[PDB]
Amino acid sequence: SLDQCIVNACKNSWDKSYLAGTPNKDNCSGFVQSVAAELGVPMPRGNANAMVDGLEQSWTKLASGAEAAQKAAQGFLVIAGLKGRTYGHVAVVISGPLYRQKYPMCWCGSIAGAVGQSQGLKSVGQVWNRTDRDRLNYYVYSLASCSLPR
Ligand SMILES: [Cl-]
Ligand SMILES: [Cl-]
């Protein structure tokens, strides 16, 4: 799989604070911003809800979590997102076998603490609850790859 630069960016972004005084581990949107910044990928800005709005507008929408995992394996930046009535959530999809043959692996920060956080060993199906899991949107930046040629 070709996601090593993405994973590296996730690892680096974990300890950064995109927003003053707010660790990215505790801020899903700031985490994703820092990942994109390291990768040089234009990323819609703002809170999780504003990010999903932006991604809907300007990124390529994928059909499934299966496809999300495939695109991440090809070295493309893939964001999983779902708007909330109050606050949304966003995560970076990484390569790896699908959880329950449906849900791709991810990294994400969360204000919720450990229950909403992933350092790559949780799938989106173990961060979002049983109902939200099957309603997630997956967006890919199809314009340029986030991998260096083999
Ligand atoms: Cl938010
Ligand atoms: Cl693509």
Numbering used by the authors: 3 to 152
Paper lines:
Most importantly, the T6SS from the Gram-negative, pathogenic bacterium Pseudomonas aeruginosa was shown to inject at least three different effector molecules (named Tse1, Tse2, and Tse3; Type-6-Secretion-Exported) into the periplasmic space of competing cells. Tse1 was shown to be an amidase that cleaves the γ-D-glutamyl-l-meso-diaminopimelic acid amide bond of crosslinked PG, and Tse3 is a muramidase that cleaves the PG-backbone between the N-acetylmuramic acid and the N-acetylglucosamine moieties. As injection of effector proteins by the T6SS would also cause cell death of siblings, P. aeruginosa co-synthesizes the cognate immunity proteins Tsi1 and Tsi3 (Type-6-Secretion-Immunity) and shuttles them into their periplasmic space to confer resistance. Tse1 adopts the fold of N1pC/P60 papain-like cysteine peptidases, which are widespread among bacteria and of which homologues were identified in eukaryotes, phages, viruses, and archaea.
